[PDB]
Ligand binder design. Structure first.
Ligand SMILES: [Ca+2]
Ligand SMILES: [Ca+2]
Ligand SMILES: [Ca+2]
Ligand SMILES: [Ca+2]
Lengths: 264, 260, 260, 268
């Protein structure tokens, strides 16, 4: 019979001059109805991690099979690009950095390739983004600066900016990532907003989910407080737990129904 | 055939020179086993409110009947004293105030009377306290300044301090809350105080749309930064009775776990 | 400052020759744009009860205010007609009975009046029905015999059939429920009926301590065996308002998802 | 390295009863290496047919769930252990009861339990011993609790094989095959029949145990779990019953832990 499946493949990036793996979830109907188009969720991993973690430890396919069957989530393409690895040798991060223009890769190469190949609807209304930790920050800032591309953002234990609680080499990959995250602080972006920016932020649906024992809780609180104070509607949840995969797996049961609601 | 019940009665306070109404939940076994003793939960109402609201809108009996039957909560006495009413006419608050020493009434009159009359076990390990809004602040500062009396505190949408006519009762309450800021109490703590705070189990529950969220956040950060174990939950919602009724499903099993 | 509201009003029924009370929930936006139309949920009460019980004990407005704010429910009209009262003095039931043609009242008088008066969109894709106990059986059989009218059915602790003087209202109701057994309707279905049933989304929610659990199990088993998709939940609890109030948090997001 | 941490350990015990090395996987609390004198309650957590001992740790994520629930106080620290009772059903013995040529229950009670509870510092009484499992393991847990009520205070049965389903059973026409032998064993030890045929003495024994039955609305074993619950209720034996969304799958069994672990903690 027909079944949802997880596929891992690769795309060569001219921007990065590098092979880029990615892992994709394909709905049960994908091979059955060759004409059907789908919403898409870009689902980003955290630092040190690589593309397969959402399928393998997040159990994306099993959660989707549950929620699709109950109607709580719609069939959608879910994809996780590789933006990680051993931080000492491999570039971690989602923004354009000196020597590593990941964001340019994401929008000019990755997204076009994926949405063509996996039959994504292709409009803003059916494109959402979510992620954990470093990926939560990437998801959030992508939503902030590309509000014309995303209808919803679900930020898990997100690296909204660098916590208050340092590499010896200021020119190492992790040092470069640190400065990139600071420069693109999701908190700062909201705090410095004029009325036009506030109005754009309001065109996006936001959901912030971070555990009470998480070292990034304080930065997510600042993000939520800035949003709430700026009059930008935003859901905020602080559940039991910390910076771990039980938090991120369980977050999927809130995330997938949330983006489904916004898609519709 | 035995059933849990809610009873409303009054105590005369010499300390206050005033009748004080209170509403108490009595477990299903109360009339069945006349010799059984129970743990107690003091469950405080918010500003403007009076004693019956936890039974009438919180549906305390219905929730207990559910959670006692599943084993998630133990049988306990639950009691709500009157500490409010129209804020322009009636005294609102839990701390000793000029002319209205509510806290002295609570500890020297109310508590001894309740625990004798309704067969409360009577020690610290079997006494907990919780409340919403003004009552959440009252529960918290009571647990802070009387850690010898309580094993657990569950603070709902709590008036931990004032969010961002000096002879009025409302002005007097306001000064009392600032003076007894639950946030300040943790922030100024020395090592001895931190050790005392650690002897109590703390649970802080406040909605993402609540005007008191920022103060509760301040309280949790102070606790966490001082190394005092504390659960924090921010659930969907605001300063309302759906939040406080649903909080009972976390609070009653929580104090049950802490009870010895 | 627009607010959602609950309104109780009355309609005269020629079919019944009786005044019929009803209670309706109106969305926050109702008075704000007086040309906006809404989907509708018919939300039925149980035996002995009357129309206002869903607003008063089910806290329908407070639950809607929560779920509308979070986006989990859409704005909808919610309406509860009176179909009960003291069973010894007042007619209880939702089907056409000898001397009391309530179903005829419902479809020929009540529904048209309500959907015109309160700006209901008016098609099947935006009409759903739910109920508890007697009202759960009523909702289920309405959906079964009027699949052209309802896209979704949410049955709480439903009187799917009688669990296991002759001219009293109670005896007449008892016969009516047996004659219109929700279980029977499914077990005797041919291929065309099964296809009709599949055009409706079904959700069945009944607690593990409920005296009607066995009839709901029979109903679900019949549905499942006939290949008619149906969600089934058995949660902790019994035939009580904590069950029915909490069911709302599953029911309202469910019909919202089904609404086209 | 500067922290103590809960641990999952896999080891083997040689069984003389079975003439077989029996692997097992055990969860050890964060305090295990830190307070060498602490004794613990124990939960026996059993796997399903076709599976082996490591599945509860690897797919159930038992360590991660315990680390969460221990920190919140919802679960107490406890030893959790899964013995190997499975593997490929055409090659390996599957099952929990004594069968011809494979007396697994005798192994469990006379070899496995004493060895585990000594080695991993279990308190060792009924009041601190619980059992749970999924599918085949759910039937194993339930019937153990039924016939060894003096050993267990609580049973949590997930998607349990309470008896052979009217539909969905694995074909077992070869009477000398291990799968046929298991099938007969499950029938003879029907969890449903055990309650149905109970006299007053048996009912009293059953009431000394806390029972929790948890099975999804789309599970092929739902109908048998319903019969078990109905028999329990009708017999006046207190039992929790939940039917949640889902089927015979690991999302159901992982999420079940979040009810199971606090549940046995309450009963301990
Ligand atoms: Ca916590
Ligand atoms: Ca909210
Ligand atoms: Ca129950
Ligand atoms: Ca289902």
């Amino acid at each position: 019979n027909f079944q949802s499946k997880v596929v891992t493949d690769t795309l060569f990036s001219k921007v990065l001059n590098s092979k880029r793996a990615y892992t994709v979830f394909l709905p049960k109907s994908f091979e059955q109805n060759k004409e059907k188009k789908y919403p898409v969720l870009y689902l980003l991993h955290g630092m040190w991690e690589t593309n397969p973690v959402w399928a393998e430890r997040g159990h994306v396919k099993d959660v989707m099979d549950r929620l699709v069957a109950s109607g709580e989530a719609c069939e959608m393409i879910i994809v996780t690009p590789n933006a990680g690895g051993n931080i000492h040798l491999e570039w971690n991060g989602y923004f354009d950095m000196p020597g590593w223009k990941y964001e340019t890769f994401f929008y000019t190469e990755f997204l076009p390739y994926i949405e063509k190949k996996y039959r994504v609807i292709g409009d803003r209304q059916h494109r959402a983004i979510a992620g954990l930790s470093m990926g939560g920050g990437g998801a959030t800032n992508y939503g902030q600066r590309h509000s014309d591309m995303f209808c919803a953002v679900y930020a898990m234990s997100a690296l909204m900016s660098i916590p208050e609680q340092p590499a010896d080499d200021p020119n190492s990959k992790i040092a470069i990532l640190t400065r990139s995250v600071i420069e693109n602080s999701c908190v700062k972006y909201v705090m410095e907003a004029d009325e036009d920016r506030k109005a754009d932020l309001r065109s996006v649906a936001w959901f912030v989910d971070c555990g009470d024992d998480d070292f990034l809780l304080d930065r997510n609180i600042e993000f939520y407080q800035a949003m709430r104070n700026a009059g930008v509607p935003c859901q905020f949840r602080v559940r039991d737990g910390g910076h771990d995969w039980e938090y991120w797996h369980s977050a999927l049961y809130q995330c997938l129904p949330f983006v489904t609601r916004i898609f519709g």
